[PDB]
Structures are given as structure tokens and as C-alpha cells.
Nucleic acid binder design. Structure first.
Ligand SMILES: [Mg+2]
Ligand SMILES: [Mg+2]
Ligand SMILES: [Mg+2]
Ligand SMILES: [Mg+2]
Ligand SMILES: [Mg+2]
Ligand SMILES: [Mg+2]
Ligand SMILES: [Mg+2]
Ligand SMILES: [Mg+2]
Lengths: 51, 132, 138
RNA sequence: CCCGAGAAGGGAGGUGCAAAGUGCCUGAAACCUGAUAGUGAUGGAACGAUACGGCAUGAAAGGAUCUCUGGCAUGAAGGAAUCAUUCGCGAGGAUGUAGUACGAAUGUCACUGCCAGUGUCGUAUCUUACGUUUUGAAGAACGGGCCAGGGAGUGUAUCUU
RNA sequence: AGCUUGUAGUCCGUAAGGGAGACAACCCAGCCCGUGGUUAAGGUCCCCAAGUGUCGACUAAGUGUUAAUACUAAAGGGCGU
RNA sequence: UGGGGCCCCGAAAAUUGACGGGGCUCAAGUCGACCACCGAUACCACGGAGUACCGCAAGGUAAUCUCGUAGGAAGGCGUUGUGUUCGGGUCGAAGCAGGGCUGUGAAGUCCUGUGGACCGUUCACAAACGAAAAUCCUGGUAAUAGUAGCAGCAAAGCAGG
RNA sequence: CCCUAACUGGAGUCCGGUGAAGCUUACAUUCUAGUGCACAGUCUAGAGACCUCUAGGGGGAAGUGAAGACCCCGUGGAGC
């Protein structure tokens, strides 16, 4: 769950900000691959079979 | 110093390339002068309404193979020689001074560069970069 | 030094504008009040009072009243006067009501193709009549 | 050691291969201060492209029959002027001169010390940004103050090729 | 109706460049790069390259100086010419 | 009396404005004709690039090849690492600022300065591999601007030391 | 209110100190008309315009604030 162990949710429209998920007690964006500290979109998987 | 070996057809193509590349546009990405975040390298214009993608003459030339230099003199140094990048002393044996000039690698140290220059000078090989 | 007496305003203006754009001379135009505008007097007066009273006061056109200034303005419209070439041309043009004292006795010329005796009728007014009906003292 | 109210700071002077001078390796951009070049208080706006000029620069990495200026030879397409004759109401046309002189360029011989490039400004022509949504975007449609960095077709299984 | 819905051709969409003041789709033209030449559409009084061109008439209203055109007023009348 | 051309009346709109503008009257308008010229990337010529097809190759052919959105197809550039080949570096690596040259270009290389220890290269193979945009994210930092506020509900200070 | 005037204190105005924020792709001294997705500072043709600064009220920037809450659409919800 690297980058994904947050409870961040979006603010929605009406605040002049992007709709990205944010921390419940701050405006800091979380969990999305283009957020700092967010998850890697399409990372290497230990379950990948390279043989 | 050995005379450049270039037959008259190659001379004619060399002068043709000189004239034609004197007129070649710089091929900067569209609007690179308008944003400091943008580099000057070429990017293909992609927007549907972009004036340079639509090929308005005023917006500057698009990159296309019609601007290629003549194939006989393509890649030659402006002195007429062929640029050969020498990364060590052992590479100077594969070069003949009639039509090739060596360019010594930029990270070669002064101690080795002096030896490379001595060997090139004994071989008669032209050097594009040295200390003068 | 061009004598504007008995000359068509637009044709004299076109000739002088082309000469100024040929860029080798200073042109003086004298007797600008005596230039001719073909057409009926009512129509010319109507169009000139429409042009005179048009614009906005803070912005709009300020159409001149003096016949020399009107003639310079007429030439002004046949030049690229917002450009350096046109600005240079307008700086080399001087138009006068009557003859200025300095140019008195100088040798003048007349444009043969702008002559008003080439007109086929008597429907014309002089530029001075237009200027004085617009309230210009000259 | 000097200035400074100074347990600040600055100057001078040292240490060190190097200030690297303590959140101190390298030390970009935005942004800000100053300098230099060009321009500039009569001036018109997608900030550029192209051509030609002014000013500045042009050490290296670019040219040296290269740059400048001319001669001579060959020259594709094209192709006069002038004059003679003739036709036309006329603007003009045709025939000859003449496919001549010239002509992209290609060679060659002299002359020359610049040229390429770069910055800025000027003149000329052209262009109402970019991405998007759109039948239609310069739009009074949506997006971005700016810069830096991050930011989106991946793995397992299975089928097909 | 610059409306709505068909059809044939051709365009814009996705079409530069040249010309119409500007013009998605109107005219020339489909366009690799450079140079020279000659044309196309369109234009030749100035802005603006090239005609103040020629012949024969008309218009007196600045009418007009507006290919197509969503960008251009009718019926009716005139011993105006 | 009939049939025709052009014009006139019919004909009133809101900021000052539109033959593109100036202006134009045996025209610079209209009609019928004509003459010469200007004017594209069209067409012609020369030179060059690429492409398609053919050819063992050398090369040959192209009036019948060269616009392009969605989109398909082909070949390349770059980033980091692995195997492997061959190297460079304190006589100065990477990075950074600016510049020269090559390449259609992705980019590469070199020069100057700065920097102080690492960096490439052959043939292959991989991927957490390329940003200008997402009211994108994080950080830094402008214009606004020496501006608003430092008043309103309890207007409080002055002299001398 | 006719129809406003004078005056008082606090702001403002000017000076010293302190010191933010919000609109912003760019450029930008405009005005008229046309054109253009039929509501242009930037296009077209004209008309204007020497630059900088201060004060001032808000004409315009279809000013800024808010992914319209009206209408429709979604084989989207919720409550009743
Ligand atoms: Mg990045
Ligand atoms: Mg059509
Ligand atoms: Mg579409
Ligand atoms: Mg098409
Ligand atoms: Mg076009
Ligand atoms: Mg495509
Ligand atoms: Mg970025
Ligand atoms: Mg449905």
C-alpha cells in the first residue's frame, strides 16, 4: 500500500482547488500517482514472472 | 598539413551544402520564445488549431527531410574533412589523413592529449581541437 | 512648388502623394483655397459637413477646416503616413492658402491631368468655399 | 588589528589544493539588485519567421581560392533594348535585328581581410498565442502568475493472431 | 430564418501558399528544400507591384466605385436622359 | 403608342464611420470590346533531400511520387540499469552557465568558465524510461505594493527630570 | 422630500514606522465601424495617441469570487 495508506478524500467543487484526494485535516494531496508521496502508477510487481 | 582529397563533384556538393544550410531554419519548438519553461529543441506541433502544425509560413518551417544536406558531403566538418572523435591513442591508427580530421574527446586529460597530438602530428592527421 | 489653382483635389493629391513617395524632393502647394472639387455644390457641402461634424471629442476624427490643412489631409489619406516612409513624405509637404511670402515670385508648376478644364460640366466648388462654409477664416 | 553600543556585523589579515566559513559539496531557474550592449519620452500590440541594413561583439571551439571586389570561359528555363519595314481607328501588334546581348549556375584567374555566428534596433512582407472542447477557437468557451522537480498502457490468467 | 430535414458533386473538418479589407469551407492552387524565369486568380489614380491605357457610348444621382455571397431594398411612378 | 439602357422619386434609427480608406465626374462609375503590364510555393529550368518499385550490385524509373485530423504501418533519438567488448578521469569525471560545429530532427559532439570524483563505449537485453498543460501535486518565488490594515465598540496624553 | 447648507469627531488626503491578500498565457496609449462561434484593446480599414506620476468616482475589461443551485441529460444518487 505504498502511497495508499491514507484516508484522503476529495474536497469537490466550490473551493477553487483540483479534485484530487486530500488529507482529512489538511489540503495536502495524497494517494494519487501525481501527488507527492502518492502511489506509483504501474510499478514493478513481485508477482511478475520474469522466467 | 595534407591537402584535402575532395574530387570536383564532392567540392560542388560541399558548396551546395554550404549554400543550402546557410538558409536552413533553426527549427525551434513553436512558442519557445514565449515561455521560459520550454526548451529550444524541436517538438512536432500537435494541436489541431496550432498555426505551425497547420503550416502557416509566418510561423516558421516544419522539420522535414527536404532540408537534408547532399548525401556525399553529409556530416563533414566545415573545413571539408570528416569528423572522427578520438577517445584514446589506439584509435589514431584507423584514420587516414587524406580526408579525415580527428576530434580529440573532451574528457581526455592533458597528459594523454599531448601524446595523442604528437602521434597525430607524426601521422600528419589534422586535429580539430588542440591548444594553440 | 505646385500651383493648386484650378486643379482637381483628388488628382492633385494622388500626383503629389506618388511624387513624395518617390522620395527625392520637397513639395510646396500654394493657392490651396483655389483647388477644385467636382460634383454638385449641395452634395459636396453635405459630405464635407458630415465629415467635419463626425467624430468624438475625446477620441474622434478631427477633420480640419483650413483649405491648406484639408488639402494636406487629403494627401495624408493617400500615403502610408503611419509608417516611416509615409511620415517622411508628410514631413516634406507644405500646403498654403495663397502664396507664402517666402515662396513669392518662385517658379511654380501645374499638373496637366489634374486640370479642372478637363471636366465636362460646371458642377464643382473650390476648396475655399467648402472651408469658409465650414467656418474657417483664411 | 581597525570601525561599530556590540559576545551583531563589516574591513583588513590569516588557515586550507580549494572557503568548502558551520542548515557549510556541487549550487540551475523563477524572483530580486547592479553592470554592460542595443534602443528609447511622435508611439501600435502573439513578443516571431523571412530578406536587407545600423550599432555592438565575433579568444576557443567555425571558413583561408574562406570573405570582399572584379575579369574571362561555358551556360538551362527564359530573353531584351534600340533601330528598319509593315499592319492597326487607337493603346499597340507582327517580321528582322535575335534565340542575339544577357541569364540560375558551373569552372577558372586576379584582388581583398574579412566572413560565418551572436545580441539589439530599424525598414519591408506574413502571421489575432498554446493545449482543449468544438461543425466552427484570437474568442466575450474551458486551462495555466512564474520556475524547479514529481506526474498517466502496468502485472497475472486466458483466447486469438 | 446564418431555420429544419433530404439528395448529387465538391470542399472545410484535416488544406498550406496566392487573391478577394478582413473571410473554416468564395476564386487560383493542393504544398519536399534552394535559386532563376513565366504565368493563374485577381489587379494596374494613391495607399499598393503594374495603365491617370485605347476605342465607342451612357450616368449627374458621389448613383456607383459590392463575382458567389447569411455581407446587396420592393410594388408603383418619372414631358430625367 | 410599344419595346429597351442608365439614373431619379418611392427611401425613416438609434456612439462618429465606412466604396477597405483617400478620393474620383468625356471617371478612378456603368455598358460593349480591346491592348500592354503586374502578380503564387501553380507551370518551366537547374541543383539538392526523401520516398515507392525494380535491380546480385553498380544503379534505373517516377507527367502519372512528396498537404494532412482520428488512425494504422516503418525506422531512429534520449534516460537509468544488466550481460559483454573497448575505453576516459585529480595533467581534472559528473553536473552547471554560455558558446562553436554536425544532424531534416529527436540529439550528439567540441570550446570557455565553474566544479572536485567519477564517467563512458561495441553488440545485445531490460524498465518505476522522455511533460507545457490535468481549477494537476510538492517546494520556491513575483506582480499586486511600500499598497490594504495598524480609525468606528473606552478620540489621551503633556511638561520637567 | 422640495434642495440642500454649515458645523463636530473618526477615516480618507499628506508625512514617519510597520506591513499582507485576492484576479495574472502573453502583449497592451486607445476610439469607430466591420469581420469573426452572429457581444474585439490585439483581426480588417480608418481615426487618434509624447512619456511618467498623483488624486478621484467606478463606464469597459461580456472585471474578480463559486466545475450554474434555473433547464435538460445520466439505463448517477438520496430522502419521502
Ligand atoms: Mg520531470
Ligand atoms: Mg467549393
Ligand atoms: Mg473534430
Ligand atoms: Mg480536404
Ligand atoms: Mg488560404
Ligand atoms: Mg495522425
Ligand atoms: Mg512542469
Ligand atoms: Mg441512456
Amino acid at each position: 500500500y505504498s502511497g495508499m495508506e491514507t484516508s484522503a478524500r476529495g474536497w469537490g467543487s466550490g473551493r477553487g482547488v483540483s479534485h484530487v484526494p486530500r488529507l482529512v485535516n489538511s489540503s495536502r494531496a495524497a494517494r494519487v500517482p501525481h501527488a507527492k508521496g502518492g502511489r506509483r502508477a504501474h510499478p514493478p510487481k513481485p508477482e511478475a514472472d520474469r522466467s | 598539413v595534407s591537402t584535402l582529397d575532395m574530387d570536383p563533384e564532392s567540392r560542388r556538393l560541399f558548396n551546395v551544402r554550404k549554400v543550402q544550410k546557410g538558409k536552413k531554419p533553426q527549427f525551434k519548438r513553436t512558442c519557445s520564445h514565449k515561455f521560459k519553461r520550454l526548451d529550444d529543441n524541436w517538438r512536432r506541433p500537435r494541436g489541431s488549431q496550432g498555426k505551425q502544425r497547420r503550416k502557416y509560413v509566418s510561423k516558421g518551417a516544419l522539420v522535414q527531410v527536404g532540408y537534408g544536406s547532399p548525401a556525399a558531403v553529409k556530416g563533414l566538418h566545415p573545413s571539408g574533412y570528416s569528423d572522427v572523435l578520438i577517445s584514446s591513442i589506439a584509435e589514431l591508427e584507423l584514420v587516414d589523413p587524406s580526408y579525415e580530421a580527428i576530434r580529440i574527446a573532451g574528457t581526455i586529460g592533458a597528459q594523454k592529449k599531448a601524446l595523442i597530438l604528437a602521434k597525430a602530428e607524426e601521422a600528419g592527421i589534422k586535429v580539430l581541437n588542440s591548444g594553440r | 512648388v505646385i500651383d493648386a489653382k484650378g486643379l482637381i483635389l483628388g488628382r492633385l493629391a494622388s500626383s503629389v502623394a506618388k511624387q513624395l513617395l518617390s522620395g527625392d524632393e520637397k513639395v510646396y502647394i500654394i493657392n490651396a483655397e483655389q483647388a477644385i472639387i467636382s460634383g454638385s455644390r449641395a452634395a459636396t457641402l453635405r459630405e464635407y459637413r458630415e465629415t467635419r461634424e463626425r467624430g468624438a471629442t475625446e477620441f474622434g476624427p478631427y477633420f480640419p477646416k483650413r483649405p491648406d490643412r484639408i488639402l494636406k489631409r487629403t494627401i495624408r489619406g493617400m500615403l502610408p503616413y503611419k509608417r516611416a516612409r509615409g511620415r517622411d513624405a508628410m514631413s516634406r509637404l507644405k500646403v498654403y492658402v495663397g502664396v507664402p511670402y517666402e515662396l513669392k515670385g518662385a517658379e511654380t508648376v501645374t499638373i496637366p491631368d489634374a486640370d479642372m478644364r478637363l471636366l465636362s460640366s460646371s458642377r464643382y466648388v473650390e476648396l475655399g468655399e467648402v472651408s469658409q462654409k465650414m467656418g474657417s477664416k483664411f
